[PDB]
Design a protein around this ligand. Sequence first.
Ligand SMILES: *CCC(=O)Nc1cc(Nc2ncc(C(=O)OC(C)C)c(-c3cn(C)c4ccccc34)n2)c(OC)cc1N(C)CCN(C)C
Length: 312
Amino acid sequence: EAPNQALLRILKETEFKKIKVLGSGAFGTVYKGLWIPEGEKVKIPVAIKELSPKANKEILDEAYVMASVDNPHVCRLLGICLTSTVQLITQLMPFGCLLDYVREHKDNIGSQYLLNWCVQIAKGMNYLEDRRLVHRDLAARNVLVKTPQHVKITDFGLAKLLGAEEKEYHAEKVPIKWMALESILHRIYTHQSDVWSYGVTVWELMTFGSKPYDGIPASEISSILEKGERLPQPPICTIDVYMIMVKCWMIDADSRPKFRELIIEFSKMARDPQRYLVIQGDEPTDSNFYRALMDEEDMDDVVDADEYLIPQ
Ligand SMILES: *CCC(=O)Nc1cc(Nc2ncc(C(=O)OC(C)C)c(-c3cn(C)c4ccccc34)n2)c(OC)cc1N(C)CCN(C)C
């Protein structure tokens, strides 16, 4: 489409420090860290990722994808550090992923927060659809929590930018339980295939972190969805909400709702949240807070990445 004039920033290894490991899985290792631009008098909480020539190619692909997106509900890239293994510096989300958050605070999450998260996730995905970007890994684990009122979409290791005349992406290890049926059978990925993963993501939030298709091997899932079986209706979900999930899981990809329409539907429900989610008993940004998770004492000059918009 248009020329991608995004600026790729290079960060010095001495400007930032690692603090603790947040996760060490197949992707690599994600660190909690602090970035201090030299001479800026600013401390920025960051997340650092590192995955050989093949490792440097994949993370530079992720840096290329993240540098092309800038949206309040999409994690922003801060830059890369050119070590032997090039590292990915992103904005740190202090409260973690939404999957662990709904499990830890299951008895304290109201209907207003669940519906608000659905609106924000759809806003981020609709922006990615505007950017011709297919995420291919939309899940509750990849929706991180900046604040309980603000979430962002993350993990672009599988994200693929589309050509202007490219309607679908043809793939050649994936999360089977979140993929659309056409993605499992024909390796076809589309913005409508992300709507399917969006439906599973909402199902994770409404079940407060239940594993979809729990106890079922991923090999048998292709035959389950093909027979017409879907995820069950969560107990707190009214039919208004569960109908939206079923629409995201329809066989016809074009029949599924668009992220633009999902923003509207969940926004209407957010006006009257107790009418669409039935939860019993439906009724923190400080300098001290950052001192704990960053394990630092002097946090007067802390600035979140959303408030740091600095050309180098
Ligand atoms: C769902 C598990 C999880 O997210 N764990 C987690 C995450 C975070 N916050 C955070 N912030 C930024 C990033 C990130 O974008 O990393 C870039 C790619 C460098 C991440 C993150 C992204 N991926 C792919 C991860 C994998 C494993 C771990 C983190 C990431 N995450 C925090 O903030 C403190 C904590 C946290 N866990 C450890 C919290 C444990 N809960 C049980 C409370």
